[PDB]
Amino acid sequence: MEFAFYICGLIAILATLRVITHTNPVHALLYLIISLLAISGVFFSLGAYFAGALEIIVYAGAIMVLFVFVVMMLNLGGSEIEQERQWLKPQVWIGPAILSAIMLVVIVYAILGVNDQGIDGTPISAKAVGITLFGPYVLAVELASMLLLAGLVVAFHVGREE
């Protein structure tokens, strides 16, 4: 359980770091797939089985759409790789590097002072999540339907041709 958690978290961290500092967009999407699979393994190690299943299920479809858009626009051989590699310089990354590092330092310092009894990893079932979702969280479900409707309408209005 902790074996799976630590190895999946390490794989997720390394794959995300590979994603944000990569030049090829298809390779970046593959590392994003690997990172999201690893985060799903982290979810499975914590007993959140439904969340891990949904993490693999809906991001496999979502990154497929990203691949569709990458094939539509970005992939050109070495032209987009040369253009993207020229966009990345030592100064351009070293600027926000300490900013992210000190944000992580402050957040980690705040984390380390909290009371922690440990996560026992007892599985919280999909049935319990469904009971809570359609119980105390009814308005969350209906207004989330309205939110996805708004996303549909915005995507239709913007992403058209003529």
């Binding site: 926000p96 900013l99 944000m103 957040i107 310092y109």
Partner: protein, 54 residues
């Protein structure tokens, strides 16, 4: 000596400081989205550090 009204200029000093500070602050609105994200991250760092020290 006084025909320029020196006290009026001394009291016009805060208006000049206001123009200068406003023109300096307008430099931050360069129009770049990545700078806006960076400024949000900077403000997050500042807010979190201020909450940690107090």
């Amino acid at each position: 000596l006084l025909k320029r009204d020196p006290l009026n200029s001394m009291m016009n000093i805060p208006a000049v400081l206001s123009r200068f500070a406003g023109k300096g602050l307008l430099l931050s609105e360069n129009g770049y989205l990545r700078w806006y994200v960076a400024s949000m991250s900077i403000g997050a760092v500042v807010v979190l550090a201020l909450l940690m020290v107090l």
